[PDB]
Nucleic acid binder design. Structure first.
Length: 89
DNA sequence: GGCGACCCGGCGCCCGCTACGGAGTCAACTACGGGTAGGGGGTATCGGGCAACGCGGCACTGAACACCGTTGTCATGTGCCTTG
């Protein structure tokens, strides 16, 4: 939807708003996924705590890795998101 | 419903200096791609060492004059002897 909106060719206004709405719903689902995986990322932050970096800082950096991973994740892989994410985390 | 205790946090300090011990720390991986950094190779540019000239002090050139200084020199003046 956002790809089609990004193109310069003219689209109908109602169709453009529908595409924007679908992209917004995708954004909402993205944040749903991130909040779901917050627990995994804090677990992996535990896994590297106590090495001179504050635990919440490690959590935040892992969260950066998490947003990267979701930005690079899709169902085309026949695996759960948990297995794929942990590498990027 | 402001007083009221009380409660609680929250804070704030807690004589002076010397002099007086040591120390030192548990949890991935690899692939790429660039960029720099070093290496030697070679090259234009700057710096240090010798030959030709110029001075400069003095030095010789004494040669040619000068400065006293000396014994050359002397035509011309005292002293004794002979004659008016």
């Amino acid at each position: 939807a956002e790809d089609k909106l990004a193109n310069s060719d003219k689209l109908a206004p109602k169709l453009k708003r529908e595409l924007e709405i679908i992209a917004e719903d995708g954004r909402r689902a993205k944040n749903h996924l991130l909040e779901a995986n917050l627990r995994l990322v804090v677990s992996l932050a535990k896994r590297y705590t106590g090495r001179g970096m504050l635990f919440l800082d490690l959590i935040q950096e892992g969260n950066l890795g998490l947003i990267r991973a979701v930005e690079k994740f899709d169902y085309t892989k026949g695996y759960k998101f948990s297995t794929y994410a942990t590498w990027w985390i």
